[PDB]
Amino acid sequence: QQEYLNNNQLDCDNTHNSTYGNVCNSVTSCQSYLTFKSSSPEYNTPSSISYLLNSTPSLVAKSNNITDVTPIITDTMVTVPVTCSCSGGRYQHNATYNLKKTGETYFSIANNTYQSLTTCQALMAQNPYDAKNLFAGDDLHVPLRCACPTKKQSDAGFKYLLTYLVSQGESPDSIAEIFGVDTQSVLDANELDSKSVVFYFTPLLVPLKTEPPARLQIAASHHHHHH
Amino acid sequence: QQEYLNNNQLDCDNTHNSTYGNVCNSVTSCQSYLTFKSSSPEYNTPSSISYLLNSTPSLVAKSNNITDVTPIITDTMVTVPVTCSCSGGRYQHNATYNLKKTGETYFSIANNTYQSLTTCQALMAQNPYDAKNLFAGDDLHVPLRCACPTKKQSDAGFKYLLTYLVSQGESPDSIAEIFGVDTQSVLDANELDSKSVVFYFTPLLVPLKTEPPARLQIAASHHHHHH
Ligand SMILES: CC(=O)N[C@@H]1[C@@H](O)[C@H](O[C@@H]2O[C@H](CO)[C@@H](O[C@@H]3O[C@H](CO)[C@@H](O[C@@H]4O[C@H](CO)[C@@H](O[C@@H]5O[C@H](CO)[C@@H](O[C@@H]6O[C@H](CO)[C@@H](O[C@@H]7O[C@H](CO)[C@@H](O[C@@H]8O[C@H](CO)[C@@H](O)[C@H](O)[C@H]8NC(C)=O)[C@H](O)[C@H]7NC(C)=O)[C@H](O)[C@H]6NC(C)=O)[C@H](O)[C@H]5NC(C)=O)[C@H](O)[C@H]4NC(C)=O)[C@H](O)[C@H]3NC(C)=O)[C@H](O)[C@H]2NC(C)=O)[C@@H](CO)O[C@H]1O
Ligand SMILES: CC(=O)N[C@@H]1[C@@H](O)[C@H](O[C@@H]2O[C@H](CO)[C@@H](O[C@@H]3O[C@H](CO)[C@@H](O[C@@H]4O[C@H](CO)[C@@H](O[C@@H]5O[C@H](CO)[C@@H](O[C@@H]6O[C@H](CO)[C@@H](O[C@@H]7O[C@H](CO)[C@@H](O[C@@H]8O[C@H](CO)[C@@H](O)[C@H](O)[C@H]8NC(C)=O)[C@H](O)[C@H]7NC(C)=O)[C@H](O)[C@H]6NC(C)=O)[C@H](O)[C@H]5NC(C)=O)[C@H](O)[C@H]4NC(C)=O)[C@H](O)[C@H]3NC(C)=O)[C@H](O)[C@H]2NC(C)=O)[C@@H](CO)O[C@H]1O
Ligand SMILES: *[C@@H]1O[C@H](CO)[C@@H](O[C@@H]2O[C@H](CO)[C@@H](O)[C@H](O)[C@H]2NC(C)=O)[C@H](O)[C@H]1NC(C)=O
Ligand SMILES: *[C@@H]1O[C@H](CO)[C@@H](O[C@@H]2O[C@H](CO)[C@@H](O)[C@H](O)[C@H]2NC(C)=O)[C@H](O)[C@H]1NC(C)=O
Ligand SMILES: *[C@@H]1O[C@H](CO)[C@@H](O[C@@H]2O[C@H](CO)[C@@H](O)[C@H](O)[C@H]2NC(C)=O)[C@H](O)[C@H]1NC(C)=O
Ligand SMILES: *[C@@H]1O[C@H](CO)[C@@H](O[C@@H]2O[C@H](CO)[C@@H](O)[C@H](O)[C@H]2NC(C)=O)[C@H](O)[C@H]1NC(C)=O
Ligand SMILES: *[C@@H]1O[C@H](CO)[C@@H](O)[C@H](O)[C@H]1NC(C)=O
Ligand SMILES: *[C@@H]1O[C@H](CO)[C@@H](O)[C@H](O)[C@H]1NC(C)=O
C-alpha cells in the first residue's frame, strides 16, 4: 500500500507527504511499470517515449508487442518497464528532462509533459531552480512515481506494481478488470475504500500478478474478460 | 589517412581490407562524428537517430542546434557525435540493430538502414548469422565507420574526423567547402588523388579543425564561404 495522491499534486503550494513520492516500504529495488499516452510529434515512438521516461526502446517494444521503431498512434496508452528503487526514503525512477521552451513550469512538466507520472512537489524538492526561474535549457531531475510490492502484496501473488494514468470515466473496478486483478487489490494498493473517488490525471498503483497486457485498450473490452 | 572504400562494399563477396573498417592507426579512442539523413517515420528525431547510431539525443540536438525532441525534416543530413575506439585492429563505433522484418539483409541494413555508415562485410565479420539465415528479432552488432585523427592530421590542426555520407553531385572540393577545410586535406584523409572518383552512397572521411557546422545544407551555400 501507498497513499493516494488525492489531487494534492494540483496545488503546488501543498506539501502533503504523498506528493514527494511513494514511500520506501519494501525491497530497495524491483522491476516496475509506468504507463504513458503516445503524444505526437514529440513522444510517439519507443525511442522518444523511452528517452522521456528513461527506459529502453527494446523494453517498451516488448512490453507493447510492437517494434522498437514503429510510430504509436496518438493517445494510445503504452506500458513502460522501469526499475524502481529507493532514494531518500522514497521509491522513484529517475529520468532527466531538458526544458524546451521558456514558459514551461514544474506543474506543466509534471502534469502535461510527464502526464502526472511525477509531481510539481517532487520536482521542486529534487531540483535547484525556483519555480519562477526556469528557462529553456535547464536540466531537471525527474522523480517518476513507481513502487515495489510490499511483502503482503508479494505474498498475495503480486509480482509488480504498475503506475496507471487514469482517464476520465474509469474507476478502480474498470482498471482492475484490464489487468485481471480484484478491485479490492487496487483499493488496497492505494489506501482507498470502495467509496473513495479516484480522479483522472492522477496516477494510481495497480498490483500485477503477471506482466501487463500488451494492448491496454482492448484489454478493457468486456469480451476480453470473465469467460 | 584511411583507405577509401571505393565501392567494395556493394559486392558482399568482396573481401577487400577496407570493408572490414578503418584501421586503428592512432589513439585508441577519440571524439568523432557520423552523419545521417533523417528518414521518416522511423529515424527522424534525435531520439530515434540516436537509438539507431548509439549516440545520445542531447549530443545530436547540440550538434545540430535543435531541441532533443523536435522532428527533423526528411532527408536533412544531421551530425551525430560518437566515440570512436579501436577494437580488433579497427576503429569503429558500436551500435546494435534488431531486425524488424524478415527479408532484411546485411546489405540492406548496411546500405539502406545505416545509409552506408557500415558495410555488409563488417556486419558479417562481427555477427554469427549466415547471410541467408537472418530473421526478424535477430540482434546485430553494428560496427559503424569512424576514425581518429592520425598524429600527422592532429599536427595540422585537425581535431576530429567526420564520416560524411556522400550524395549524388558532390565532390571532394564541394565537401571540403562545407567544413572550411582544404580539398587536399579530404583527399589525404581518404588516400585519394585529385582525379580519384568518389561515389555517392559511399562514406568519406572529412578532417575537421572545429566542430562541424550545425546546419550542413546551408553550409554548402557559396555565400557561406570565401568572404
Ligand atoms: C485472497 C486470499 O488469499 N484470501 C485468503 C482466504 O482465502 C483464506 O481463507 C481460507 O480459504 C481457504 C480456501 O478457500 C479455506 O479452506 C477451505 O476450508 C474448508 C474448511 O476447513 C475446507 O473444507 C473442508 O474440507 C475437509 C477435507 O475435504 C472436509 O473434511 C471432511 O469432513 C467430513 C465431514 O463433512 C469428514 O467425514 C466424517 O468423518 C467422521 C470421522 O472423522 C465420521 O464420524 C463417524 O460417523 C459415524 C456414523 O456415520 C459414527 O458411528 C456412529 O457412532 C454412533 C455413536 O457411537 C453410533 O450410535 C452409530 O451406530 C454409529 N454408526 C455407525 C454406522 O457405525 C462414528 O462414531 C463417527 N466417528 C467419530 C470419531 O465421531 C463422519 O461420519 C464423517 N462424515 C461424512 C459425511 O463423511 C471427513 O473425515 C473429512 N475429511 C478429511 C480428509 O478430514 C470438510 O467437510 C470441509 N468442511 C467444510 C465446512 O466444507 C476446504 O477444503 C478448504 N479449501 C482449501 C482449498 O483448502 C479456509 O477455510 C479459509 N479460511 C477462512 C478463515 O475463511 C484466509 C485464511 O487462510 O486468508 C486470506 O488471506
Ligand atoms: C599546410 C602547412 O602547414 N604547410 C606547411 C608549409 O606552410 C611549410 O612551408 C613554410 O611556410 C612558412 C610560412 O609561409 C614559410 O615561412 C616564411 O619563410 C620566408 C622565408 O624564410 C620568410 O620570409 C623571410 O622573412 C625574413 C624576416 O622578415 C626576411 O628577412 C629579412 O631579409 C632582409 C633582406 O631581404 C634582411 O635585410 C638585409 O640584411 C643584410 C644584413 O643582414 C643587409 O646587408 C648589408 O647591406 C649593406 C648595404 O645595404 C652592406 O653595406 C655595403 O657593403 C659593401 C661591401 O663592403 C660596401 O661596398 C658598401 O659601401 C656598403 N654600403 C653601405 C651603405 O654601407 C653590408 O655589408 C651588408 N651586410 C652584410 C653583413 O652583408 C641588407 O642590406 C639588408 N637588406 C634589406 C633589403 O634590408 C633582414 O636582415 C632580414 N630580417 C631578419 C629579421 O632576419 C626575409 O627577407 C624573408 N625572405 C623572403 C624570401 O621573403 C617568412 O617570414 C616566413 N613566414 C612565416 C610566417 O614564418 C616557410 O619558408 C615555408 N617553408 C618552405 C620550405 O616552403 C612547410 C615547412 O615548414 O611545412 C608544411 O607542412
Ligand atoms: C536517483 O536520483 C537520486 C537523487 O534524487 C539518487 O540518489 C543520490 O545519489 C547520489 C550519487 O549519485 C548521492 O550522492 C546522493 O546522496 C543521493 N541522494 C539521495 C537522496 O539518496 C539515486 O542514486 C538515483 N538512482 C538511480 C538508480 O539512478
Ligand atoms: C494536466 O494535463 C492534462 C493532460 O494530461 C490536461 O488536460 C488537457 O487539457 C486541455 C485543456 O486546456 C484539453 O484541450 C486537453 O484535451 C486535455 N487533455 C486530455 C487528455 O483530456 C490538463 O489541462 C492539465 N491540467 C490539469 C489542471 O489537470
Ligand atoms: C565494440 O565491439 C567490440 C566487438 O566487436 C568490443 O570488443 C570486444 O569486447 C569484449 C568485451 O565485452 C571482448 O570479450 C572481446 O574480445 C572484444 N573483441 C575485440 C575484437 O576486441 C568492444 O569492446 C566494443 N567497444 C565498445 C566501446 O563498446
Ligand atoms: C543503397 O541505399 C540507397 C539509399 O541510401 C539506395 O538509393 C535509393 O534507391 C531507390 C531505388 O530503389 C530510390 O527510389 C531512392 O530514392 C534512392 N535513395 C536515394 C537517397 O537516392 C540504393 O538503391 C541502395 N543500393 C545501392 C546498390 O546503392
Ligand atoms: C507480438 O506477439 C506475437 C505473439 O502473439 C509474437 O509472435 C510476435 O513476434 C510479436 N511481435 C513483436 C513485434 O513483439
Ligand atoms: C541554437 O543556436 C543559438 C546560437 O546561434 C543558441 O543561442 C540557441 O540556444 C540554440 N538552440 C538550440 C536549441 O540548440
Distances (CA, A) of B199 to A162, A227, B7, B111, B176: 52, 63, 7, 13, 15
Check if the beta carbon of residue A93 is closer than 8 Å to that of residue A146: yes
Rounded CA separation B115/B104 (Å): 14
One-letter amino acid at A85 equals S
Tell me the three state secondary structure of residue A51: helix
Secondary element (H or E) of residue A30 = strand A29-37
Angle at B213 between CA B211 and CA B215, to 5 degrees: 145
Residue carrying C-alpha cell 525512477: A93
Instruction: Specify the length of chain A in residues.
Output: 227
Distances (CA, A) of B98 to A159, B121, B174: 28, 18, 36
Instruction: Specify the length of chain B in residues.
Output: 227
Rounded CA separation A187/A181 (Å): 11
Residue carrying C-alpha cell 514558459: A103
CA-closest candidate to residue B48, choices A36, A62, A100, A69: A69
Angle between the N-to-C axes of helices B46-53 and B57-64, in degrees from 0 to 180, rounded to the nearest 10: 120
Which residues, judged by CB distance below 6 Å to any ligand atom, belong to the binding site of ligand 4?
A 10, 111-112, 115, 201
Q: Write the burial class of residue B55 (CB in 10 Å: 0-12 exposed, 13-18 middle, 19+ buried).
A: buried
Q: Are strands A29-37 and A139-144 parallel, antiparallel or unpaired?
A: unpaired
One-letter amino acid at B218 equals I
- Give me the residue spans of the domains in chain A: 1-219
3-state secondary structure chain B: CCCCCCCHHHCCCCCCHHHHCCECCCCCEEEEEEEEECECCCECCHHHHHHHHCCCHHHHHHHHCCCCCCCCCCCCEEEEEEEEEEECCEEEEEEEEECCCECECHHHHHHHHCCCCCCHHHHHHCCCCCCCCCCCCCEEEEEECCCCCCHHHHHCCCCEEEEEECCCCCCHHHHHHHHCCCHHHHHHHCCCCCCCCCCCCCEEEEEECCCCCCCHHHHCCHHHCCC
Sequence-ordered list of residues with C-beta below 8 angstroms from that of A3, at least 6 positions apart, any chain: A17, A18, A23, A190, A191
CA-closest candidate to residue B121, choices B4, B202, B8, B35: B8
Rounded CA separation B59/B62 (Å): 5
- Within 8 A of A47 by CB-CB distance, chain B residues are 45, 47-48, 50-51
Check if the beta carbon of residue B107 is closer than 8 Å to that of residue B120: yes
Rounded CA separation A18/B37 (Å): 46
Sequence-ordered list of residues with C-beta below 8 angstroms from that of B197, at least 6 positions apart, any chain: none
Rounded CA separation A101/A83 (Å): 29
Check if the beta carbon of residue A69 is closer than 8 Å to that of residue A18: no
Cα pseudo-dihedral B204, B207, B211, B213, rounded to 10: -50
Q: What is the resolution of this structure in A?
A: 1.4
Nearest-atom number in ligand 8 for the CA of B65 is: 14
Q: How many CB atoms lie within 10 A of CB A37?
A: 16
CA-closest candidate to residue A80, choices A34, A44, A119: A34
Continuous H helices in chain A: 46-53, 57-64, 106-107, 120-125, 151-155, 172-179, 183-189, 216-219
Q: How many CB atoms lie within 10 A of CB A187?
A: 20
Q: Does B54 touch chain A (CB under 8 A)?
A: no
Residue carrying C-alpha cell 590542426: B157
CA-closest candidate to residue A44, choices A17, A66, A76: A76
Rounded CA separation A23/A17 (Å): 9
CA B54 to centroid of ligand 5, rounded, Å: 15
Rounded CA separation B184/B162 (Å): 16
Rounded CA separation B220/B176 (Å): 9
- Distance to chain A for B71, nearest Cα, Å: 7
In DSSP terms, which residues pair with B84 in a beta bridge? Answer: B30
Check if the beta carbon of residue A123 is closer than 8 Å to that of residue A109: yes
Tell me whether residues B48 and A43 touch, CB distance under 8 A: no
Rounded CA separation B27/A182 (Å): 61
Rounded CA separation A196/A190 (Å): 10
Rounded CA separation B44/B80 (Å): 13
Sequence-ordered list of residues with C-beta below 8 angstroms from that of B72, at least 6 positions apart, any chain: B38, B44, B45, B46, B49, B64, B66, B78
C-alpha cell of residue B77? 543530413
C-alpha cell of residue A43? 513522444
C-alpha cell of residue A29? 529495488
Ramachandran angles phi, psi of A162, nearest 5°: -120, 135
- Within 8 A of B67 by CB-CB distance, chain A residues are 98, 100
For an interface test with B, which of A47, A52, A98, A104 has the most B Cβ atoms less than 10 Å from its Cβ?
A47
Technique used: X-ray
Tell me the three state secondary structure of residue A102: strand
Rounded CA separation B76/B215 (Å): 9
Tell me the three state secondary structure of residue A60: helix
Rounded CA separation B54/A4 (Å): 39
Chain centroid offset of residue A196 CA: 20
CA B24 to centroid of ligand 7, rounded, Å: 41
Rounded CA separation A164/B90 (Å): 47
One-letter amino acid at A75 equals D
C-alpha cell of residue A37? 499516452
Rounded CA separation A204/A186 (Å): 8
Fill in the DSSP letter of residue A120.
Answer: H
Continuous H helices in A99-166: 106-107, 120-125, 151-155
